[model samples]
Target: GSSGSSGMESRCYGCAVKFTLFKKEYGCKNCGRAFCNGCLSFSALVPRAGNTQQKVCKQCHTILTRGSSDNASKWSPPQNYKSGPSSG
Candidate 1:
C-alpha cells in the first residue's frame, strides 16, 4: 500500500540509530519520520502548524528553509491531509 511508514519507526531514518533508547526519540513533524535527537534537531514553522514551529528532520529543514521561494515548490502536508476534492 501507499500508506507505509505512516507510524513511529523503530530506527532513525537519517542515521539509522537503533531506538533501543531510554534516551527518547522524536518524530520529524514535517516528514513523519523517526530520528535521533541529534538528527531531529531544529524546529521550523511546518505547514501542519502554520502559526507555530515544530520539530522537523534535517531534509525537511533544508527544504522548508528555501531561503528564496523564488519560483515555486510543494510542501509536505501533515499526517492526515487530502490532496484532492475532499472535506474536513
Candidate 2:
C-alpha cells in the first residue's frame, strides 16, 4: 500500500539511488514506484488509458510502450491480413 511517496524512503526504486530535496524525486505513474529524476525522466503516452502523458521509470516505460504499442493483443492488423497464410 505504501508507494514511498511520503518521503519515507530516501532512495529511488529504480536504481536505489539516494535523493534529497535538492536531488528531487519523481514517481512513476505506471508502477506507482518512486524514483529520482534521473530514473523517471522519460515520458510516454499509455494506450487504452486516454492517451495522456505519464512519468515512468525506464523499466515501466519499456513495459508500457510495448504493452500499448503495435504489439498490443487487442490491436489487430488490417482486416485484409486476417485471412492470409491461415487460409492457405
Candidate 3:
C-alpha cells in the first residue's frame, strides 16, 4: 500500500473531497481523519448489485477486505483497489 505522503488521485471519504484537488489530506468519512491518496480508496457503484458508489479510507477498507463476519456492517470497500490502499 502507498504511504499517505504519496501524491495521487483519489476521493476523500469525508466531505466528498477529491485528491485531485486536496493536497495535504484525504479525509475519511468513517474515521474522519486526513490521509493521503495512499491511505484511501474509491468504492465505485455496483450497478449489478443495485448500489451506488462510495469512498472509503484504508483502515475501513481493511476491515471490509478481511471478509470477516463484521464485514456485514454498512461499510464497504473501495472499488478501485489497484489504485490505492492495497498498494500503499
Task: Output the number of the TM-score-best candidate.
Answer: 1
lDDT of all predictions:
0.73, 0.74, 0.52
Q: Write the per-residue lDDT of candidate 2 for residues 1-88, one digit (tens) a residue.
A: 7565555557899888888867798887767788999999887775434666787788878886675433446765564666565321
Off by over 4 Å in 1: 1-9, 67-88
Better of 2 and 3 by lDDT: 2
Candidate 3: tens digits of C-alpha lDDT, residues 15-67: 44565544556555544556566655645333333444445566555544554
* lDDT per residue (tens digit) for residues 1-88 in model 1: 6766656448888888867656468797777788888789978878877635888888888877874434344764553476665322
Lowest-sum lDDT 10-residue window in model 1: 67-76
Model 1: per-residue Cα lDDT at residue 2: 70
Instruction: Judging by lDDT against the true structure, name the best candidate.
Output: 2
Q: Rank the candidates by lDDT, best first.
A: 2, 1, 3
Worst 10 residues of 3 by lDDT: 44-53
Residue 65 error, candidate 2, Å: 1.5
What is candidate 2's TM-score against the reference? 0.57
Q: Per-residue lDDT for 75 in model 3?
A: 65
Ranked candidates (TM-score, high to low):
1, 2, 3
Clashes of 2: 0
